[PDB]
Amino acid sequence: SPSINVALKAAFPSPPYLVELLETAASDNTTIYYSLLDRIAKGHFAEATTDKALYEKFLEVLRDDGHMDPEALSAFKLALSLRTATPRVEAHYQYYTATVEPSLSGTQEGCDQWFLIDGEQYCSPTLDTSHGKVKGEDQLRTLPFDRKFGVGSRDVILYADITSKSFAPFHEVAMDLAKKGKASYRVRYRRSPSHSRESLSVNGYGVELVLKRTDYIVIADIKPLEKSELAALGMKAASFVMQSEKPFEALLKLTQDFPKYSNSLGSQNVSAEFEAEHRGNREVFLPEGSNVLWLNGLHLIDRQIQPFGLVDLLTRERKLIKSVLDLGLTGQQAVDLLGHAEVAHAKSEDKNELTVLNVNKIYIENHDLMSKVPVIEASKESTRDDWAALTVVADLDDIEGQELVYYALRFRKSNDGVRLDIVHNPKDTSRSPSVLAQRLKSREDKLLDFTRFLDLETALETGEFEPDVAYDASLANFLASSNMKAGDNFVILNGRVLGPITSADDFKKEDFEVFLQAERRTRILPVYKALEDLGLDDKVSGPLSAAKLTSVTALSTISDLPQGIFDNAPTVRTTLFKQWNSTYTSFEVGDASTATIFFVAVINPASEIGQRWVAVLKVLSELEGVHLRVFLNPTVMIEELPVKRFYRYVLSSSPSFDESGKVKALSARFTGVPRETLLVVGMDVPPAWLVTSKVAVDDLDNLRIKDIKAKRGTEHVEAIYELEHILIEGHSREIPGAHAPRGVQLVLETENNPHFADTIIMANLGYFQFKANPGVYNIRLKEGRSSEIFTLESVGAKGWGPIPGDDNTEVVLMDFQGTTLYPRLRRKPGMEEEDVLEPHAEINIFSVASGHLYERMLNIMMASVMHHTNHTVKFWFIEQFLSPSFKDFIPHMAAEYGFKYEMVTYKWPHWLRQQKEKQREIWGYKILFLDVLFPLSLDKVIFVDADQIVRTDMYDLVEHPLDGAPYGFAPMCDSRVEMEGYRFWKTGYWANYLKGKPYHISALYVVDLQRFRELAAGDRLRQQYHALSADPNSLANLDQDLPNHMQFTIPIATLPQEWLWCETWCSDETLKDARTIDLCNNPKLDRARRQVPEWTKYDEEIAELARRVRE
Ligand SMILES: *[C@@H]1O[C@H](CO)[C@@H](O[C@@H]2O[C@H](CO)[C@@H](O[C@@H]3O[C@H](CO[C@H]4O[C@H](CO)[C@@H](O)[C@H](O)[C@@H]4O)[C@@H](O)[C@H](O[C@H]4O[C@H](CO)[C@@H](O)[C@H](O)[C@@H]4O)[C@@H]3O)[C@H](O)[C@H]2NC(C)=O)[C@H](O)[C@H]1NC(C)=O
Ligand SMILES: *[C@@H]1O[C@H](CO)[C@@H](O)[C@H](O)[C@H]1NC(C)=O
Ligand SMILES: *[C@@H]1O[C@H](CO)[C@@H](O)[C@H](O)[C@H]1NC(C)=O
Ligand SMILES: [Ca+2]
């Protein structure tokens, strides 16, 4: 039974299932939230002891209280598995811990639940018992996780642990108060004392087992490698799926355990060149072996396939399709109507401007308004192609308002196919709107018979009516739904909201004709024709019935906002997937009639990308109302081994439950694993996550089952990771002339400590990031030059904007997608100075390792420095590359060798080109993020390449003058003569480019961090790496070649030859006056005992130390 298991746990305690279901079910819908909060305070959910039963009962009430329908209920199941609401809950707790507790003056008892009213806290429902003044920051501030119910003078906030029924009476009272209309009610959470500090188990990530031995090519103990028959493997693998008759199940089993059955392909006449003719699909559309996903016609991408991203996309697109299915269309017709070529041509440098609203929606809610307004219907003799539903909003008290209505009336006289509606929107509460509307609703029949303007003004004063209260109520709802101010003039044809109107001179009779003409060309005609092509021109029978379709389709052109995503607003509905014949390469799963969601996947089985897509897709199909047509299109061109890994996705469509009812954790277990093959563990985690290994026995970088069978006795690999941080990342800009405010330094703070974190603004589109967990934070400019020239106006937490209400320098993260920011900073008047120009411990060494040999020699590196130094040395490392076995042991090194150590990390920016091999990633962390990795307090760092023996006091290098250089290096030895043929750096390319500069070595170096930032070296390293990374062959060693190619622009200080020694280019005599030896590559265990005699001495010191701790 050879298996490997990987599980992921969050950096916070599990909030009870009770509160999670409340927040997940009432996703955001506050009306659902309080109707369920009432039922949990009633006592209906008290019998739910086993968390599964609690979930079970929530299904009953959601469906029974009308809150959820089966189609959207399946989405509830999947989102609940994902535990989407847990970080939202932890935000309340962190806020309670950092802002609420300190302000709460006095000792709490019986105050498990308490209200906050006017700076006073009350622990009793009676309101007569006030425990204390709520000092410090006022907690009545509007925060994202809040939920406002009712309007009131008093602002009531209930901090509750809902697990105890003691909350129930407090709620009922506040609920009564809010429903009466005396106060605005909002619910915040208190860390429930019934639940334990058991970390939360997360899902929605992927695991990879990379066979690092990929040099092979010309149940199963080793990876079988074939000759030049690779070419067809993708093709026969695809046929193997069709032959199976459990197709997407085969696709998964084959794609996830690819190496296993790799050579077994091309056997038992699976040659099946049936889909060879199926390239009729290829012959007209997209290339062989290309990965393309679509959702209702829209363009889906590789990393829009994180479970979190998909859940919000289903939710938004079901709402869009359901808006269309109120118009009598099927899921397939609705999508084909939306994803039609006539529609795509209406859309497609940089340019955009517009505002539109739903016609179906607005005429349903505002019934007593829209069926009681003066309606001049379009004469039934007008053609389908002429129909339009003009709706005019106007203040009939002012001349400009009544002038626009007159111009609309004259326009209706000329255009037969227009249904004209007039809604009175006054700005004075004394004149009830219902009376002026009913004044002209009497003259509705006699409307448009107005020759002079005075005829309308006189008709407004004739008659006397009663203020129809029902009318006024539906009017207020309309203006709120449509975001229309009182007394403002608006013109809305077919849903396209246009206005407000400044003066009625802007909009005359002739201007209305043109508005119909332009709207007709864009949203009316392409609908009629796309509609007539699909044989659905029967559904459009009336000016109003037509407008509902044209209006919905235009709204399908608005994408995200983008929150969490960077894809601002494109996605053009395509339709060419339909030309492809679905005989061989395609298979479908789900009913095409009841499906609201249409996933059209085009995956190549020989691709590594296909592995993830398939794994997610199975889970996505398990939602009642999701259709999936999977196209398999392989390529004939496979020069190397197509897939170089094993892959599993941790995700479930239905919530997992323990035997005791609690939530069951989701794990990635790989079965029938070869015992002879070398493996590496990698994580396929969503963009906002920072993940490092927690507890593991087996070296995550160097693995083989047969070896741990010979060490532990079992073939069961088990490891744990931690989602340690969630990113707060953003793109900075300058106000008003949008530029890159590079060199700007930032501080993240909380009401707990104001020096939480610090980073600097990057040159590539203003990138910055912070490693944080759910909670309320603030962002201030770092103490100094950043605050001098710049003042941060806002952190764009709501969108690019500016958005009214986003000028808050406050950030709060409450999602597994983090919080994407678009801050805006304006310069202080009359200045134009950049930070670049002005108006800790003795030694600071940093290192990294990625193997137990490198880790054993890293223990030696630390020990060698301390033996030869009488100074305060501090070690800095990259958290995630080290094994947990090494991480468990470093505090014991710190105590025995007398050093301190702080552990840094940074997540590779999404824009920056990543490296697939673990090795190439290692190299990038040494050179690319030096400026941002360390806090702004650290003056200088020194890198020592882990497998090293230092014999000199390293303080000398600290105070070595660099002379205008941000970093200093040790050069290549030209001492050994016999290896001159190997000295490539003094030849052709490296000789012409390096005119006289020496080839420096990326093994030992000094970084004067304050000069590094001052010079902005990192940004130049990063952007140069960018275009060079197109060919990985140019970056032979990106840690070494990058500073060497950049010594022409970024200065390189040269360090003495005594500092660096190698057993290939420096003579043995140099070792006498040695400072550091890299133990040069081209194994190390032999070279260490041979070159350095004291290497054994250090190894043995460590060996005893671990056993000393052991007892
Ligand atoms: C945010 O959340 C709220 C709350 O869920 C939603 O508001 C809902 O708005 C509508 C209009 O007021 C309510 O509609 C309800 O329709 C029920 C009938 O539905 C059936 O229709 C077909 C018939 O063929 C069936 O096939 C189908 O299965 C449906 O079941 C009525 O029975 C409802 O009456 C009463 O229901 C509940 C009791 O169960 C009461 O709490 C209500 O007050 C109501 O008197 C009702 O007419 C819907 O119920 C509203 N909810 C509430 C609680 O008021 C929002 O739409 C939602 N928004 C989003 C974006 O999710
Ligand atoms: C089975 O494979 C052989 C070799 O490719 C082929 O000649 C034969 O025709 C195949 N069988 C059938 C029934 O086509
Ligand atoms: C460290 O300090 C001791 C005591 O002052 C001194 O004897 C020793 O020489 C120092 N170490 C080195 C390497 O000089
Ligand atoms: Ca080394």
Residue numbers in the entry: 28 to 245, 279 to 408, 662 to 1152, 1197 to 1439, 1445 to 1473
Paper's wording?
Central to ERQC is the ER-resident 170-kDa enzyme UDP-glucose:glycoprotein glucosyltransferase (UGGT). The enzyme selectively reglucosylates a misfolded glycoprotein on one of its N-glycans and promotes its association with the ER lectins calnexin and calreticulin, thus mediating its ER retention. The full-length Chaetomium thermophilum UGGT (CtUGGT) crystal structures revealed four DsbA-like domains (TRXL1–4) arranged in a long arc, terminating in two β sandwiches (βS1 and βS2) tightly clasping the glucosyltransferase family 24 (GT24) domain (Roversi et al., 2017). Overall, UGGT's motions can be described in simple terms as two rigid groups of domains moving with respect to one another.
To assay the contributions of individual UGGT TRXL domains to UGGT reglucosylating activity, we cloned three mutants of CtUGGT, each lacking one of the TRXL1-3 domains: CtUGGT-ΔTRXL1, lacking residues 42–224; CtUGGT-ΔTRXL2, lacking residues 417–650; and CtUGGT-ΔTRXL3, lacking residues 666–870. CtUGGT-ΔTRXL2 and CtUGGT-ΔTRXL3 expressed and were purified. CtUGGT-ΔTRXL2 also yielded crystals, enabling crystal structure determination by X-ray diffraction to 5.7-Å resolution. CtUGGT-ΔTRXL2 and CtUGGT-ΔTRXL3 reglucosylation activity assays against urea-misfolded bovine thyroglobulin detect impaired reglucosylation activity upon deletion of TRXL3 and complete loss of activity upon deletion of TRXL2. In contrast, CtUGGT-ΔTRXL2 is completely inactive against urea-misfolded bovine thyroglobulin. The total loss of activity of the CtUGGT-ΔTRXL2 construct in the reglucosylation of urea-misfolded bovine thyroglobulin also points to a critical role for the TRXL2 domain. The CtUGGT crystal and cryo-EM structures (Roversi et al., 2017), and our MD simulations, all highlight the TRXL2 domain as the most mobile in the molecule, supporting this hypothesis. In the light of these data, it is possible that TRXL2 motions adjust the size or vary the surface area of UGGT's central saddle, making the bending motion a crucial one for activity against this substrate. Our observation that the face of the TRXL2 domain overlooking the central saddle bears distinct patches of hydrophobic residues conserved across UGGT1 sequences (Roversi et al., 2017) supports a model of hydrophobic-mediated misfold recognition. Our data support a “one-size-fits-all adjustable spanner” UGGT substrate recognition model, with an essential role for the UGGT TRXL2 domain.
